[PDB]
Symmetry: D2
Subunit: 286 residues, 4 copies
Amino acid sequence: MEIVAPVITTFRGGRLDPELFANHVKNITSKGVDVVFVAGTTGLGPALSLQEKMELTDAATSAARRVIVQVASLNADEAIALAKYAESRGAEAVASLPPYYFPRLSERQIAKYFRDLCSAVSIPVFLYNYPAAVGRDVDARAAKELGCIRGVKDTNESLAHTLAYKRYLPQARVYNGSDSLVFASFAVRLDGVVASSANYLPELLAGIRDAVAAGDIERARSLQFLLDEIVESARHIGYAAAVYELVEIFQGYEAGEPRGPVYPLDPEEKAWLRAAVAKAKSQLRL
Amino acid sequence: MEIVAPVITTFRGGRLDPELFANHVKNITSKGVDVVFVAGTTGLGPALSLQEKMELTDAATSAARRVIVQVASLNADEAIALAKYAESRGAEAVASLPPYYFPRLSERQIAKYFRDLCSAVSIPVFLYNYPAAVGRDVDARAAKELGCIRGVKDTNESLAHTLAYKRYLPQARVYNGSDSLVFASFAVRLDGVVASSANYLPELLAGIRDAVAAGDIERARSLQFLLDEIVESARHIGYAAAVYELVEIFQGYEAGEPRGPVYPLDPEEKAWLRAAVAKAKSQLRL
Amino acid sequence: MEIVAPVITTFRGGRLDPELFANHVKNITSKGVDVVFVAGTTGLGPALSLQEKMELTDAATSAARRVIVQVASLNADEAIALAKYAESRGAEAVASLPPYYFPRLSERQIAKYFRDLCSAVSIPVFLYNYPAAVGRDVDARAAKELGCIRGVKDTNESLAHTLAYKRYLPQARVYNGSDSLVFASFAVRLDGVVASSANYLPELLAGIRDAVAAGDIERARSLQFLLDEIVESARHIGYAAAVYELVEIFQGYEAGEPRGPVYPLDPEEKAWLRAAVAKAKSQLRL
Amino acid sequence: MEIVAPVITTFRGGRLDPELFANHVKNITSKGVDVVFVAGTTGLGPALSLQEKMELTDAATSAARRVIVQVASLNADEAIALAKYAESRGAEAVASLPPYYFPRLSERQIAKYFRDLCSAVSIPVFLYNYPAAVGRDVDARAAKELGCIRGVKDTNESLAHTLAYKRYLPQARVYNGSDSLVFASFAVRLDGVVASSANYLPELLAGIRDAVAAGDIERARSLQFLLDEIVESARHIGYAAAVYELVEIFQGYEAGEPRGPVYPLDPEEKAWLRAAVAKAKSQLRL
């Protein structure tokens, strides 16, 4: 079972910094990340222009051997163009959010979007489902009804919703994206996890996976609860910005910054977070 | 009290068509539209490039005397740039959605976004609130606390939520954005309405306004109910794409197309919509 | 247009005090309440035994000329039984919540419940819709389909939702039950309001009704906002218990108390609430 | 890890039939049910009078060695009365929903409800959490703060929400109540499940438990998916009434019926369900 990192997009001086990005990717893949997922929500995907996603695709595919690229755009031609680009750069798969923002698009519109993406490339197309952010759900039955989905990332608190993709699409690779469900995902033998914490504590996720595989459910659960406490503190100050500071805290190198509306944490927020996780940090035998 | 059109963005072959747009704006403003609101949700704002939004700003300010440009972007630098551009082209105000898509941004991040817009321009900055599409609400209390909001457009079926902005911001111009609340907005004396149906039935909205002003409450209401039957059919088939077909059906000229993932309606959907609205339309006597 | 009070159920000791109830009914009906609605949510309906509701029926019909009895029970035989009892005591109508609590109920079960109710009496049966408390909505289209509904009380922040009942059911008496929409309800000419504040400020509700009729929209809105401030303070300490204390503050007599798990406000909560509404209270001229 | 049945309440004639009930309890306890949970949502608890719940308590404590009685009432005095009665009859624990139906009760009211319940008995008080039905959540933090909660049954699609009670109350016994999470609950080593399917397919739940315990984690998931198919079908016609028919289909004896507003299935619905679950039934064996 795989640890997939929905990797942060590392800005510095207003632009993408591929040196920060490459160092970060090479570190986390050394610590147990199997696959790099670029331009996911944790990577600020919908905030990135097509060219920024191309730059990120180049950086990810030159830093990691296994890369899935998130391609969604509210101009659907851009999703097709980037999917072809990712494929040419050696991505093992592409993924897409369903069309987001607009309420009450039709089922026909959603289906055409995904079918056009599948027609554009030969590599597997993944559904990246995230109803809290997207404002709609493409559930297991709908995903099967599309007729071309070969993988699912379900960023979702409902483990049963995620398991249902394995039921309706027995050949798809299915992953849950909730940090609170890493332990549970391995326990029920999903194909893997795509959790934001693979950015800052990949060795913890690997510890959970190891523990579950050894039958050590108590250790796995304990590691999970430690992770939950860290996530909880981070959510308190703006989770998406905090992920970057958590990388600095736990991995010890510069992680860059997000970009407005996802403004970087200020100095006072960074200091508060460092103290907030100091205890959980000391408890870590990984 | 004003009728404000959140005007459609008119594409041809996935490219912006400013002639279709200009003809449409000229027509609805001759039929009772007081103000043109460009790149709102009905105008596919989040789907438009910055280049497209600048072109749309040029075309709207050329075709209309009173223009508000909606500037939101998930790259905040782009919101600031377009707000300054809009001001330079003579927009009377700019509006923005709160940062959307991303769940759990912090209050500081949201406040910074709006405050940076207000500091970027001298013309009024409006809150454009649309919780169903944005995934968060900036309520009247929150809008007061921003400390620079001079207008609100509230695309919201809770009319008291919209009225609360007049309570907390007595100097602000406050509009409700729901088609189902045009009659109600005029009856409670909001500053006006920003309803998508100003695109396809602006004469019907002016008729509602006239009836309320005449104390003809029963007429205003029966006109509202006719509009509600039309909105219902349109929603059934996919509302955002449906608006374009309704413009053609009710106003009698070409309206262009939306762009995918907001794909244009297909022939069967259009035929269905035409049959669906035919009854209600006939019961109209303006 | 009517002011309908969803009257509080006055307990004293551990049990219903029908005398306190009669007195309260008499005072508010002398101050503008047109109809008394017994055992609604504000009257703690779902917490009352059949015997308590029968007792309210007797006391209300003896103290008021126009009485509607709310009869919902999760034993449908008690609803049928009480509806018959209310008719026999001279109630002008009965109302029911749809079946509540249970999430997994079919359209057929809901329709059967309302149709059996309609068969049981010859007086009008109202739908009492309150989705936030009930956990389900019976919307205008569904209410028409039931085929026997003659009135609706919609406790709902969506004025559009309530207006839809007048569209689908032109001969029904339709009331909105939100305190925040009293002004709006009279402005759009619903048949009336069934607002909790008729317990403690029936003269304010009448003042709003008078102001709308006179066309003094600005006074109507101003009175609405004062009411909103009062409701907001009450919601802070527990609205259902707070209504009783607001009756005491504004009407000057003992209102009795609710019963747990709706526990009466404690002395500190009462002192806080008195102080919280003091300014709005002094600003009240009528 | 335990299988707890939220047992159906068995009506015949519109009245309780304690002999159908006894036969049912005895059968399911012989096929792997460890504990009987009486008057839960599956048992129509909120629909039952205090006397009916006492009668159910008698029948359960006569037919089974281990009984937990669900005691919630919207008259808290009745919750206390029943808890004392359950203890007198030899129940090993009582549980309660939080106060339901009423929106926006205060934290003080909810805490007083639970603490008063704990002080009435010397047997343990469990929290029975079911946010979808109750309209409010008492999460793990809130549960710990109550200070007297000894067990938790969380009917919730969010497994991380359930797991949190083990984080905060590691001494409490914690169960998840969603049928779609039986496999997952055993996999993460909750103390067990309280799933409605214990009524009709207890042997399937015991098979899932066995398979998780071997490590045929993949056969466990396969049995769960079969259960998910059957649940899917019952949900389609109205789950609460359908549970009774599923008992007849899979266990082959008379199950009684629910009582309206939870009306029994009609002959047509029953025929539809039997055909719908025939395939699943055929692949069962066990």
